[PDB]
Amino acid sequence: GEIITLQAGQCGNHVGKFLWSQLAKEHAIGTDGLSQLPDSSTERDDDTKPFFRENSRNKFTPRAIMMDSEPSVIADVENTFRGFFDPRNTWVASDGASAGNSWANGYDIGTRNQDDILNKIDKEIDSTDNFEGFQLLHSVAGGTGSGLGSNLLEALCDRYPKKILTTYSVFPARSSEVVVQSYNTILALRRLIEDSDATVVFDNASLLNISGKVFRNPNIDLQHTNQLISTIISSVTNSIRFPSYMYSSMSSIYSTLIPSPELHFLSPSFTPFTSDDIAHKGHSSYDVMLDLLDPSNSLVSTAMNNPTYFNVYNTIIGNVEPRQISRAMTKLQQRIKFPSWSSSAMHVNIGRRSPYLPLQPNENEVSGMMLSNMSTVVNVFENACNTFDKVFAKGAFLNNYNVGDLFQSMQNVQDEFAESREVVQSLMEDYVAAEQDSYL
Amino acid sequence: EIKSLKHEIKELRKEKNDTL
Numbered sequence: 304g305e306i307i308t309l310q311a312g313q314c315g316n317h318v319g320k321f322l323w324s325q326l327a328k329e330h331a332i333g334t335d336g337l338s339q340l341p342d343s344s345t346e347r348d349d350d351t352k353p354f355f356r357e358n359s360r361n362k363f364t365p366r367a368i369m370m371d372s373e374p375s376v377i378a379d380v381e382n383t384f385r386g387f388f389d390p391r392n393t394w395v396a397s398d399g400a401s402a403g404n405s406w407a408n409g410y411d412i413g414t415r416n417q418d419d420i421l422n423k424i425d426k427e428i429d430s431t432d433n434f435e436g437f438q439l440l441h442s443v444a445g446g447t448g449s450g451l452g453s454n455l456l457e458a459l460c461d462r463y464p465k466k467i468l469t470t471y472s473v474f475p476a477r478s479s480e481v482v483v484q485s486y487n488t489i490l491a492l493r494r495l496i497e498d499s500d501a502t503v504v505f506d507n508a509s510l511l512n513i514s515g516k517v518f519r520n521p522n523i524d525l526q527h528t529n530q531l532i533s534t535i536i537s538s539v540t541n542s543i544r545f546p547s548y549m550y551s552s553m554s555s556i557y558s559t560l561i562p563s564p565e566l567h568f569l570s571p572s573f574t575p576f577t578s579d580d581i582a583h584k585g586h587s588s589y590d591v592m593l594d595l596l597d598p599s600n601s602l603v604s605t606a607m608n609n610p611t612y613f614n615v616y617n618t619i620i621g622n623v624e625p626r627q628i629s630r631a632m633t634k635l636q637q638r639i640k641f642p643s644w645s646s647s648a649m650h651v652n653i654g655r656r657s658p659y660l661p662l663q664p665n666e667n668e669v670s671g672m673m674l675s676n677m678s679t680v681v682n683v684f685e686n687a688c689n690t691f692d693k694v695f696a697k698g699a700f701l702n703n704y705n706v707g708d709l710f711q712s713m714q715n716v717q718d719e720f721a722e723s724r725e726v727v728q729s730l731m732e733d734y735v736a737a738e739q740d741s742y743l
Numbered sequence: 744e745i746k747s748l749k750h751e752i753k754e755l756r757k758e759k760n761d762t763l
């Protein structure tokens with residue numbers, strides 16, 4: 304089962320850089336792309352193929368495709384990792400969109416160059432045999448990045464019906480100049496609504512809070528947000544990168560979490576034990592399962608008032624004791640609440656620690672993370688909706704950026720924005736209907 | 744954002760000096 308990763312935008316490129324750094328340091332690859340084991344004759348206890356390609360000279364090539372419009376930022380990853388990434392997998396533009404532009408120019412450029420991108424992804428697909436699905440990594444605030452991501456997602460979903468699509472979206476924190484970024488994000492969401500099968504979102508406020516809580520002298524920690532995102536994705540993909548008893552595919556993971564394709568919005572959580580002062584707050588799996596329910600550990604700043612849980616799936620890595628998890632689940636079934644029209648959905652995915660990094664092994668040291676389906680996910684949507692619910696009327700500085708597929712045709716732009724807001728309200732209504740227990 | 748990036752680089756300098 305091969306997974307094909309795609310990254311969009313400068314933020315997506317940084318996230319991919321940190322992610323591949325963590326993966327290489329966990330699989331003992333290094334900056335060159337050679338084996339770090341003293342003897343190559345011995346067998347391994349994992350499978351690197353689902354994420355890396357293998358050649359005759361023992362060279363590991365990451366099957367990642369990065370998109371960009373200004374090659375200045377995308378060259379740093381190759382300048383730090385010499386010969387690791389394939390230079391033919393990258394794509395760069397020439398005299399495209401403006402700095403900080405809307406999604407419109409990026410979408411136009413994507414529809415212009417979607418042929419060569421499709422040919423490249425096809426020539427990268429034909430390199431393997433057992434192909435499972437795609438992964439996308441980007442943000443909704445950036446214009447060109449979100450446009451290219453939306454175009455590629457539409458192409459993938461309407462060309463490949465039997466392949467899974469999982470997306471990672473980065474959302475900006477509540478600020479002043481984000482009035483236009485969220486304005487453009489409103490329509491960028493449209494593609495994630497109908498095309499994405501599984502998706503996770505990240506907010507910058509909670510990331511900065513976790514950074515200020517963990518790292519010293521916290522001033523600006525965008526790199527630490529990248530580290531947290533990479534750690535979350537690596538802990539998610541750990542259960543497939545290292546074989547286990549039950550879970551060996553992304554579909555088996557997502558089947559126990561994603562209901563009918565209108566509630567596939569998930570919120571992640573992670574133990575303060577990072578993966579980059581780390582020896583503290585790592586007592587036991589008991590305390591991990593306890594503080595996994597802490598709202599301060601959530602990756603999105605939400606409110607604590609009898610939260611409604613649809614599905615919960617937690618993964619714990621390390622040497623775990625059964626009695627701790629037994630008692631933890633025994634009391635969490637009483638503490639956590641869920642709607643009465645469904646059944647309790649809580650799952651554990653005890654995994655394996657990487658037997659290739661010189662870790663500090665303890666008898667009870669473990670780490671943990673948890674994904675959940677929440678109804679409070681609509682709050683981050685309302686935080687952007689209330690902004691443009693009152694400014695779109697005049698549109699003085701909104702129409703200047705030419706937010707639309709056509710130029711100066713405000714009628715079609717208004718039609719697109721109206722239908723986007725209507726489908727957003729439809730998602731909100733579908734969520735509140737399941738929350739209100741109307742079917743009961 | 745340039746000043747923010749420079750101050751992140753200052754964070755990295757302080758960390759590497761602590762390691763030194």
Ligand SMILES: Nc1nc2c(ncn2[C@@H]2O[C@H](COP(=O)(O)OP(=O)(O)O)[C@@H](O)[C@H]2O)c(=O)[nH]1
Binds near residue numbers: 313403473475
């Ligand atoms: N995930 C992530 N996102 C970031 C980070 N730093 C900034 N961002 C956001 O990601 C967006 C990326 O915009 P981008 O597509 O690069 O704009 P462009 O340079 O004009 O193409 C910005 O609007 C930022 O708000 C980071 O460290 N991680």
